[PDB]
Amino acid sequence: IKPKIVKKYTGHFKRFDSNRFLRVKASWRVPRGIDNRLRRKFKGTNLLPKIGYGSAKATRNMLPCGLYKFPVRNTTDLEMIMMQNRKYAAEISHAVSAKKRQEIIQRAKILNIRVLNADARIK
Amino acid sequence: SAPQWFVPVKAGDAKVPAYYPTDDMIQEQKKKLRTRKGAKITALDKPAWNLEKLRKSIVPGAILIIVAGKYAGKKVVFLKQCIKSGALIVTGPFKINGVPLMRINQRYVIATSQKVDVSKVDTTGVDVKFFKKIAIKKAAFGKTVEEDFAKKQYEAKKALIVEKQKQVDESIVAEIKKVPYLKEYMASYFTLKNGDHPHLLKF
Amino acid sequence: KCRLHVNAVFMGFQRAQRNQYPNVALLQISGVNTKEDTPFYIGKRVAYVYKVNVKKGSNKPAIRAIFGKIVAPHGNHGVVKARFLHNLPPKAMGQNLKVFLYPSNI
Amino acid sequence: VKYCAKPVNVAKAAQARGDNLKVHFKNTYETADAIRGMKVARAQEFLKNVIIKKEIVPFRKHNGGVGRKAQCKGLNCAFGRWPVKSAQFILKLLKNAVDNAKAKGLNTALLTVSHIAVQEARSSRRRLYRAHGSINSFSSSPCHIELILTEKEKKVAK
RNA sequence: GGAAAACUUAAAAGAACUUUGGAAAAAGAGUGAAAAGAGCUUGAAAGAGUAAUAUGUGAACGGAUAAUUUAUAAGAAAAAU
RNA sequence: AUAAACAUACUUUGAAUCGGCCAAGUCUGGUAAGCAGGACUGGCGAUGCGGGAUGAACCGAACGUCGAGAUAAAGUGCCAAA
RNA sequence: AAAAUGAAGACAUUUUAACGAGUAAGGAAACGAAAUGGCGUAAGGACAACAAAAGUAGUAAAGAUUUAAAGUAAUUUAGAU
């Protein structure tokens, strides 16, 4: 069972005038200038993030697997979603060592919990 | 007992919590993926609820040009409609066309006015049982490999039943030769020569 | 072997003077000259059969297609609108399509 | 300073490099550009002919104000010069890298200049006394030159 | 009147003998957990060099839509009576 | 007669602003001005989009992300959908 | 906005309807049916394997270069070097 995750825009909302200059980063900042080509929404360049682009509520923050993300740091965090293994999927944090990962990965098999980092920090 | 959300699994000599049931009291369950029930099989003489409504231009014994599929442009003779599926049971008599006895959907054919008529065709067989018996099935998923020769040996074992069911076509060829120029018209293909526009052609 | 299609020219997309909507593609079917002869063609499958040169070390075919239908007439000259599964590339403008004879109603 | 690229096989390669060499970078980058690929037997002969001004070194990229020359026919370039000090510095690496190959035990008749790259070093600044009581800079353009000679054998691809 | 300038390593064990070279240096060799090699903790950006890939008629870059190429990526259960 | 319950009446505190410009089945000074100064109203300012080839004001019409349809100004020899 | 339900579910609940352009400017924090909703940097007081060894870290931290995923967006998460 998986509802079709529908996206109203699959691109990135890059900052205006970030394709010419390097001091202007590619993170969105709405232009406040009076003569700006974009805040007036001129034709051809009228791409701004407006709340209408927001994706469906039912399938918001849902990974393509159909399961939401739940980060775990130790084996005892897995028990927090052992009842909801059909809704949440464990994702071992990036600081957990390569020894504690084999404890979490093996325990996630016992409780039958999908793990998104099953091939991370392998030998 | 076990909650509805719990499915115990075995552990391969690894650390387990204090509350997890051990392996000696755990039985494995087979993962189940198929839930929808299949198609109920009913009598061979009752038409399905899901039956196409034939066009008024299609009557048994007509000659249908086929405009799509493997046999594109060939002219066939329509015997009767397969009730269990709604697809037409046509036969482009193999002694003339080379078109075997098959099923085809009613939207891939064009009904010409040349009605071969022919009663007493003796279609006592050629129900849905025959068509499912000669269809070349696949090799499934676990049946070893059997690459290539499985389908080659499939066709050879189905050759006899196909030939036996050619008693349908012995009678029809008799009245194909009756009408002059009807053997030549059937044997050849169908082509749209220069100057024949589809919206103007009438059959 | 035989011909079972009439070659329709990909004129372009349904546009305006300074716009373009590539969801709908216009065709000038050969032999159709008025909008009153289009009632026949509304529904018949249309395919954009093209050819791609491929290397011998690949699996993809050298002949592909993009199938679509004819949905409505357009103008009084018999031009039609065709909606495809994937919008036709603008490299096909002026090329020839195929207008099949199924789903037939004759 | 490390080498830009590592040899495919270290048993078939000889290396030589120079750090902070005092020679113009815009001149050596074009001399090292011509001899990239040619056999070490011919690259030594070509560099002997640029010195005596019988072969040209086409300035493909840095060609502003460079006059036209008669030996630049066929190279797709209308400019070319004969840098003598830049050739003499590369010629002392090809002799170093060749004599490193003899130590290993390679065959000098097959060596080719597979990789040769020129970098930008740290310049040394001077003073140039200008008009109106102003002082400008007078800085060199030293460069690091690397070099890898690999034995050439007929490749196989089944 | 009036600034700039912190950091090798746990420890100098700060290469030590050969070949090329006028010398600096380079290639082997070796120390060290690791060159971290004295310009020495990791080491971005502007500017460059090498390799791989791709494109072209008086600007370049961006956006919508497809095509081609490359990459990511979806399963082990199973019918009727 | 018609409209009006997210109607009606407000209270307290406070920001920005008082360089304006255009249109006209209008006016005054001027020979006249893309000049100077006004009365009623709509706009540009603060505003994109379709049309006038281009245009701050003209005509249509004011904008969350889209899909399908009939439309408005205006057009249907080619560039350009008809 | 109005109804319904409401001790904790969860996605800031459920149903119906109307609406959404905008420079100057305003809408501080808390307020269960929330009197706008949030992201990020640094520091301080707490919380962070609840059966007496209780967040991560030499089985590789912070940082740097990229690749993928989530979010409309500020940005977050993860893989590799």
Q: Return the bridge partners of C14, or none.
A: C21
Could you tell me whether strands A88-92 and A68-72 are parallel, antiparallel, or unpaired per DSSP bridges? parallel
Q: How far is the CA of D12 from the C1' of E32 (A)?
A: 28
Which of A79, A116, A74, A85 lies closest to B7 in space, CA to CA? A85
Which of C1, C2, C4, C8 lies closest to C68 in space, CA to CA? C8
Which of B175, B185, B181 lies closest to B121 in space, CA to CA? B175
Question: Are B196 and B203 contacting, i.e. CB atoms less than 8 angstroms apart?
Answer: no
**Header resolution in angstroms:** 3.1
- Contacting chains of D (3 CB pairs or more, <8 Å) are none
Q: How far is the CA of C7 from the C1' of F67 (A)?
A: 30
Run of H or E including D90 = helix D84-104
Q: Return the bridge partners of C70, or none.
A: C82
Name the 3-class secondary structure at D104: helix
Task: Indicate contact of D with A: 3+ CB pairs under 8 A.
Answer: no
Phi, psi (5° rounding) for residue D133?
A: 60, 45
Distance, CA of B63 to CA of B58 (rounded, Å): 9
**Which of B199, B202, B203 is the best mutation test for C, with the most CBs of C within 10 A?**
B199
Run of H or E including D46 = helix D40-51
Q: How far is the CA of D20 from the C1' of E5 (A)?
A: 24
Residues of B with CB under 8 A from a CB of A: 5, 7, 9, 11, 14-16, 20
Alpha-carbon torsion A13, A17, A19, A23, what sign?
negative
Give the minimum alpha-carbon distance from C38 to chain B in angstroms, rounded to a whole number.
Answer: 8
Q: Write out the two tokens for D85.
A: 């000090």
Q: Write out the two tokens for B104.
A: 């085809």
Q: Write out the two tokens for D157.
A: 């691809």
Within chain A, residue ranges assigned H as helices are: 75-78, 100-110
Which of A51, A94, A91 lies closest to A68 in space, CA to CA? A91
Chain B residues in contact with A84 by the CB 8 A cut-off are: 5
Q: How far is the CA of D97 from the C1' of E16 (A)?
A: 22
B109 Cβ contact list (under 8 Å, min separation 6): B58, B64, B65, B66, B67, B76, B78, B88, B90, C104
Three state DSSP letters for chain B: CCCCCCCCCCCCCCCCCCCCCCHHHCCCCCCCCCCCCCCCCCCCCCCCCCCCCCCCCCCCCCEEEECCCCCCCCEEEEEEECCCCCCEEEECCCCCCCCCEEEECCCCEEECCCCCCCCCCCCCCCCHHHHHHHCCCCCCCCCCCCCCHHHHHHHHHCHHHHHHHHHHHHHHHHHHCCCCCHHHHHHCCCCCCCCCCCCCCCC
Question: Are B87 and B48 contacting, i.e. CB atoms less than 8 angstroms apart?
Answer: no
The half-sphere exposure of C45 on its side-chain side, counting CA atoms within 13 A, is 16
C85 Cβ contact list (under 8 Å, min separation 6): C66, C67, C68
The answer to whether the C-beta of D63 is closer than 7 A to strand E is no
Give the minimum alpha-carbon distance from A80 to chain B in angstroms, rounded to a whole number.
Answer: 14
Could you tell me whether strands D111-115 and D143-151 are parallel, antiparallel, or unpaired per DSSP bridges? antiparallel
Chain B residues in contact with A85 by the CB 8 A cut-off are: 5
Distance, CA of B133 to CA of B122 (rounded, Å): 19
B64 Cβ contact list (under 8 Å, min separation 6): B58, B75, B76, B77, B78, B88, B90, B109, B110, B111, B112
User: Between chains, do A103 and B20 touch, taking CB under 8 Å as contact?
Assistant: no
Which of D36, D69, D32, D65 lies closest to D54 in space, CA to CA? D69
Amino acid symbol at C28: Q
Distance, CA of B142 to CA of A111 (rounded, Å): 29
Q: How far is the CA of A53 from the C1' of G29 (A)?
A: 29
User: Between chains, do C4 and B199 touch, taking CB under 8 Å as contact?
Assistant: no
Give the minimum alpha-carbon distance from B138 to chain C in angstroms, rounded to a whole number.
Answer: 22
Q: CB A71: neighbour CB atoms within 10 A?
A: 13
Q: Which residue has the tokens 């002997």?
A: D48
Q: How far is the CA of D95 from the C1' of E36 (A)?
A: 32
Chain B residues in contact with C3 by the CB 8 A cut-off are: 191-193
Distance, CA of D114 to CA of D148 (rounded, Å): 6
Q: Write out the two tokens for B127.
A: 């129900």
Distance, CA of C2 to CA of B190 (rounded, Å): 6
Which of A76, A80, A79, A59 lies closest to A68 in space, CA to CA? A59
B110 Cβ contact list (under 8 Å, min separation 6): B64, B65, B66, B67, B203, C101, C104, C106
Give the minimum alpha-carbon distance from B1 to chain A in angstroms, rounded to a whole number.
Answer: 15
Q: Is the Cβ of A10 closer than 8 Å to some Cβ of chain B?
A: no
Three state DSSP letters for B117-165: CCCCCCCCCCCHHHHHHHCCCCCCCCCCCCCCHHHHHHHHHCHHHHHHH
Amino acid symbol at A121: R
The answer to whether the C-beta of B34 is closer than 7 A to strand E is yes
Nucleotide nearest to B140 (CA to C1'): E78
D59 Cβ contact list (under 8 Å, min separation 6): D30, D66, D77, D79, D80, D81
Distances (CA, A) of D120 to D15, D86, D141: 19, 15, 7
Give residue C30's region: left, alpha or beta (phi > 0; psi -120 to 50).
beta
Return the number of CB contacts < 8 Å for B and C.
Answer: 54
Q: Return the bridge partners of B63, or none.
A: B77
Distance, CA of B79 to CA of B75 (rounded, Å): 13
Q: CB A30: neighbour CB atoms within 10 A?
A: 12
Distance, CA of A97 to CA of A91 (rounded, Å): 13
The half-sphere exposure of A108 on its side-chain side, counting CA atoms within 13 A, is 27
Q: Return the bridge partners of C63, or none.
A: C51
Name the 3-class secondary structure at A8: coil
Question: Are D32 and D118 contacting, i.e. CB atoms less than 8 angstroms apart?
Answer: yes
Amino acid symbol at A81: I
Q: Is the Cβ of A93 closer than 8 Å to some Cβ of chain B?
A: no
Give residue A53's region: left, alpha or beta (phi > 0; psi -120 to 50).
alpha
Q: Write out the two tokens for A64.
A: 């393509």
Amino acid symbol at B77: V
Name the 3-class secondary structure at D14: strand
- Neighbour order of strands in the sheet with B75-81: B101-104, B88-91, B75-81, B63-66, B109-111
The half-sphere exposure of B198 on its side-chain side, counting CA atoms within 13 A, is 27
Q: Write out the two tokens for A10.
A: 């699959």
CA–centroid distance for C47 within its chain: 6
Who among A83, A84, A109 is closest to B9 (CB)?
A109
Distance, CA of D143 to CA of B8 (rounded, Å): 69
Chain A residues in contact with B11 by the CB 8 A cut-off are: 110
The half-sphere exposure of A100 on its side-chain side, counting CA atoms within 13 A, is 13
User: Between chains, do B11 and A110 touch, taking CB under 8 Å as contact?
Assistant: yes
Question: Are A74 and A100 contacting, i.e. CB atoms less than 8 angstroms apart?
Answer: yes
Give the minimum alpha-carbon distance from B7 to chain A in angstroms, rounded to a whole number.
Answer: 8
Strand F bases with any atom < 7 A from protein Cβ: 46-52, 63-70, 80-82
The answer to whether the C-beta of C15 is closer than 7 A to strand F is yes
Cα torsion at D76, D79, D82, D85 (round to 10°)?
Answer: -100
Chain C residues in contact with B109 by the CB 8 A cut-off are: 104
Nucleotide nearest to D121 (CA to C1'): E48
Name the 3-class secondary structure at A92: strand
Three state DSSP letters for chain C: CCCCCECEEEEEEEEECCEEEEEEEEEEECCCCCCCCHHHCCCCCEECCEECCCCCCCCCCCEECCEEEEEEEECCCCEEEEEECCCCCHHHCCCECEECCCCCCC
Chain B residues in contact with A106 by the CB 8 A cut-off are: 14-15
Which of C39, C101, C9, C6 lies closest to B193 in space, CA to CA? C6
Q: How far is the CA of D115 from the C1' of E51 (A)?
A: 9
Distance, CA of B83 to CA of B60 (rounded, Å): 14
Chain B residues in contact with C1 by the CB 8 A cut-off are: 73, 189
User: Between chains, do C101 and B198 touch, taking CB under 8 Å as contact?
Assistant: yes
Run of H or E including D33 = helix D25-34
Question: Are C89 and C38 contacting, i.e. CB atoms less than 8 angstroms apart?
Answer: no
A4 Cβ contact list (under 8 Å, min separation 6): A59
